[PDB]
């Protein structure tokens, strides 16, 4: 075998001198043997003098200069196919449940080129989420990319879990969940909820594969784990021909991990200290997620937004790639409007009268124009109060307040925080409800009746309860 000595160690970065005519190629995986298990290094550069530079998939503590590394002869390769379902995998394809080897027939490199120009396909199927603000104003595309943008704590993980409950067991094919740099607690709670709901059966068939590299992991692992999850999803799409839905909790943690290793590599940073290749890094990850003629891949991607700064290079890079984007605003959540979706910044490719139908497009456009009018007034209203407005403005603002209050919804996964049981609202019921609100038919109802209810029949029931009380 090709073996090499460690010659430098700098955090996650390890330099290996191979002392022979043949070096490992870039992206090859090398192994070091360790007092517990093994350390995996992925080659990143050739420095010259038979020295390669490599990124470490686990902690480098205890490495010694002169320690012996062996080239495995290929990239990081992960088990793939139906034997991965119901099981939990780390960034290097090992099981991190207790259930023994994964014992799949195939193992496949986590680095691959996107589908060819001839393999592309594209849909305009609306994915009904049951979430009023999404189903009305930013309907998700089945087989498309969805991104959820929000700062810390604004609700995007609760949103993903509501989507998992509503969509994932209704979806006909397999699912893959990748947790990138989020809480190990959230992963354990997800695994328990998957077993309790039955999407995982330890003694039966399972519909979901789980891949985790959480925020306790080194930057190399948090960088590469998304590629393992995506390689499993791509195997289901191409080899099985299945329709997949791929969830990625906090794809920003992949990008940030790219910055961290880049800082150790010693590249000159872009923007606020991000790596160069940020855009091509994102392109190489995000282009593999497409649907193809072989099979559909839906994906829902949460995107943390640092300091809530949507101008941050990583959000701004991600916005270019997504078919639907949902923006969750801290201010809206502080008003108690959950699920905190900003109705105006959230947008979708599918909000097209040729796709949603003319009635839905009309209702959505009139809602958007009403809320944009209210936003335009809000600083005049803040200084002078509502009394300075015109009667047309007073009516438009009262209806805009009712509408934005009505976009709130009790999620079933978050009733612990709201007391109100969860509601699903059908798309047709949503569009009829908001059109009837736009007609002014309910302008006599108090705003509180609109808050946190599951459609207009519930608004009438709540208004009756308030009037009786």
């Amino acid at each position: 075998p090709i073996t090499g000595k460690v010659t430098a160690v700098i955090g996650a970065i390890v330099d290996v001198h191979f002392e022979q005519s043949e070096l490992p190629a870039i992206l090859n995986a090398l192994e070091i043997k360790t007092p517990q298990g093994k350390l995996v290094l992925e080659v990143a550069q050739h420095l010259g003098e038979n020295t390669v530079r490599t990124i470490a998939m686990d902690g480098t503590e205890g490495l010694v200069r002169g320690e012996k590394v062996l080239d495995t002869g290929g990239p990081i390769s992960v088990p793939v196919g139906r034997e991965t379902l119901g099981r939990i995998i780390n960034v290097i394809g090992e099981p991190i449940d207790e259930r023994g080897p994964i014992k799949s027939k195939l193992r496949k490199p986590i680095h691959a080129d996107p589908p060819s120009f001839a393999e592309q396909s594209t849909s305009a199927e609306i994915l009904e989420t049951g979430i009023k603000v999404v189903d009305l104003l930013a309907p998700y595309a089945r087989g498309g990319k969805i991104g959820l943008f929000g700062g810390a704590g604004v609700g995007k993980t609760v949103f993903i879990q509501e989507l998992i409950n509503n969509i994932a067991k209704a979806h006909g094919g397999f699912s893959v969940f990748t947790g990138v740099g989020e809480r190990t607690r959230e992963g354990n709670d997800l695994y328990r909820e998957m077993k309790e709901t039955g999407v995982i059966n330890l003694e039966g068939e399972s519909k979901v594969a789980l891949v985790f590299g959480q925020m306790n992991e080194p930057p190399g692992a948090r960088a590469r784990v998304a590629l393992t999850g995506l390689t499993i999803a791509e195997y289901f799409r191409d080899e099985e021909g299945q329709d997949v839905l791929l969830f990625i909790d906090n794809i920003f943690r992949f990008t940030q991990a790219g910055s961290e290793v880049s800082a150790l590599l010693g590249r000159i940073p872009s923007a606020v200290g991000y790596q160069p290749t940020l855009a091509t890094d994102m392109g190489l990850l995000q282009e593999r997620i497409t649907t193809t003629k072989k099979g559909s891949v839906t994906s829902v991607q949460a995107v943390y937004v640092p300091a809530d700064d949507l101008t941050d290079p990583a959000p701004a890079t991600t916005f270019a790639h997504l078919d639907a984007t949902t923006v969750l605003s801290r201010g809206i959540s502080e008003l108690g409007i959950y699920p905190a979706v900003d109705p105006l910044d959230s947008k979708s490719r599918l909000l097209d009268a040729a796709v949603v139908g003319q009635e839905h497009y009309d209702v959505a456009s009139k809602v958007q124009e009403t809320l944009q009018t209210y936003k335009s007034l809000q600083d005049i209203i803040a200084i002078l109060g509502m009394d300075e407005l015109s009667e047309q403005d007073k009516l438009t603002v009262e209806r805009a307040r009712k509408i934005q209050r009505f976009l709130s919804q009790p999620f079933a996964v978050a009733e612990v925080f709201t007391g109100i049981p969860g509601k699903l609202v059908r798309l047709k019921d949503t569009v009829a409800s908001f059109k009837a609100v736009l007609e002014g038919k309910y302008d006599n109802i108090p705003e509180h009746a609109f808050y946190m209810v599951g459609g207009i029949e519930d608004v009438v029931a709540k208004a009756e309860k308030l009037a009786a009380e």
């Binding site: 870039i26 550069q45 050739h46 594209t122 923007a271 855009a279 091509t280 392109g283 649907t291 790639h321």
Partner: protein, 485 residues
């Protein structure tokens, strides 16, 4: 022989250092034993610096590298029509190999002050707003600028689709051949655009150059220059070409990345200081040649993404300072359903007014200014103040004209059909028609003119100009129809 070959000393981040290649030219193309191609940017006393067009992953230390002898160049000619190519002119549509009239360098110096000519003949887009208000001539560089999803590509694609009217005729002085460049677009998006151009039979006269976001930053930087060299082959032979760059901003991002990997310090907005020179030397290649130079033309339509409509941002204002004008596409108009959403105030064509179709200039007249006046009046009238006298009248006509300018995607109008529409709108015949019926007016009126007054439309088409008798006949037709409508 280290004169004609070299050895890779180091490679990473898509940059390789090579020993030898002593005879290599600056900006030459080299091929690696692993088969990737690369461009020699830096020549240094003991080493060359190569930027890699493919992935580095195939390259290894000690790889043999050999020099092509050619400055980075692409195949050019008529055999690229109907083909989709990468930034290096390799076919990616999966059809057979390309047949080329020759090769042309990617970086070539634009034609100077003497060989150029004034812009004097139209790029007929078939968009009522463009052809009437911001006319584009052959050899113009009209910028398209706006927020994402505001219709920029729809404007460019409808322009390309309109050329099907002339590109089937014999008169190759009228035929306009099209090039479209995808930079940093998804493979999905460009494949769907190809499928659309196939549906409209537009591919048979179109060429598409694609460097998607999957592609290395050197390819995304290079793709506009090689697309320009393809359009220049048509220009230099004496034919007319149009070139669309569906995002120059994504090229500027790719060049910022490449500059950082070359360890060149960033300048304003962290873009490299010569990010202007990157776009300017590109866009100066769009030109109209003199008769001595064979009368050919290349027309450019660069696309820019504004952030929040901020045209003051560095890259927007850089490109505005190059492009002989701009079409500005407004999110407020687009989401209000006024599509193509061209803001008539901020859009201006600095040279295409000399190249507008004369009949359309005659009927349009002040319309470009009148719509801006209407927009100011409407911005005051929305306050609900008293609208007496001309304010009421200007609100009525300005609304109907605005309703007359919106247009369906992939339905470009012939100029003979815009001329009667703009005539009927400008002369106020639509003041009697309610605003919900103006689209019906367009559909039935062109049906009436094309049924009963085809003589007028043929004379408008063939002459491009209204006589006083022809204008009087168009008046009588419009008055009769509005009397019946």
């Amino acid at each position: 022989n280290l004169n004609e070959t070299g050895r890779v000393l180091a490679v990473g981040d898509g940059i390789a250092r090579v020993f030898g290649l002593n005879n290599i030219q600056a900006e030459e193309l080299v091929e690696f034993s692993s088969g990737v191609k690369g461009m020699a940017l830096n020549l240094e006393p003991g080493q060359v610096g190569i930027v890699l067009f493919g992935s580095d992953r195939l390259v290894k230390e000690g790889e043999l590298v050999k020099r092509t002898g050619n400055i980075v160049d692409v195949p050019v000619g008529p055999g690229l029509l109907g083909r989709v190519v990468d930034a290096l002119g390799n076919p990616i549509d999966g059809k057979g190999p390309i047949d080329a009239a020759g090769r042309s360098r990617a970086q070539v110096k634009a034609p100077g002050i003497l060989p150029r000519r004034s812009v004097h003949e139209p790029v007929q887009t078939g968009l009522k707003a463009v052809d009437a208000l911001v006319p584009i001539g052959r050899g113009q560089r009209e910028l398209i600028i706006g927020d994402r999803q505001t219709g920029k590509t729809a404007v460019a694609l409808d322009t390309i689709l309109n050329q099907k009217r002339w590109n089937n005729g014999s008169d190759e002085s009228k035929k306009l051949y099209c090039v479209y460049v995808a930079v940093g677009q998804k493979r999905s998006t460009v494949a769907q655009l190809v499928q659309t151009l196939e549906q409209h039979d537009a591919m048979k006269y179109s060429i598409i150059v694609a460097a998607t976001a999957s592609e290395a930053a050197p390819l995304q930087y290079l793709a506009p220059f090689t697309a320009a060299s393809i359009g220049e082959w048509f220009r230099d032979n004496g034919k007319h070409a149009l070139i669309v760059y569906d995002d120059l901003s994504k090229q500027a991002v790719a060049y910022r990345q490449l500059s950082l990997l070359l360890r060149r310090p960033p300048g304003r907005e962290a873009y490299p200081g010569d990010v202007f020179y990157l776009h300017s030397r590109l866009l100066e290649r769009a030109a109209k040649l003199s008769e001595k130079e064979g009368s050919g033309s290349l027309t450019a339509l660069p696309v820019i993404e504004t952030q929040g409509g901020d045209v003051s941002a560095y890259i927007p204002t850089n490109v505005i300072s190059i492009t002989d004008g701009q079409i500005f596409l407004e999110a407020e108009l687009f989401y209000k359903g006024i599509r193509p959403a061209i803001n008539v105030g901020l859009s201006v064509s600095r040279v295409g007014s000399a190249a507008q179709v004369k009949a359309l200039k005659q009927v349009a007249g002040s319309l470009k200014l009148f719509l801006a006046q209407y927009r100011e009046v409407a911005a005051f009238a929305q306050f609900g103040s008293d609208l007496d006298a001309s304010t009421k009248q200007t609100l009525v006509r300005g609304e109907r004209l605005t309703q007359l300018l919106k247009q369906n995607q992939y339905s470009p109008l012939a100029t003979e059909e815009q001329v009667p529409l703009i005539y009927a709108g400008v002369n106020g015949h639509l003041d009697g028609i309610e605003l919900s019926r103006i689209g019906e007016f367009e559909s039935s009126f062109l049906s009436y003119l094309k049924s009963n007054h085809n003589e007028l439309l043929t004379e408008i088409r063939e002459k491009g100009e209204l006589s006083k008798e022809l204008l009087a006949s168009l008046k009588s037709a419009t008055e009769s129809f509005v009397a019946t409508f």
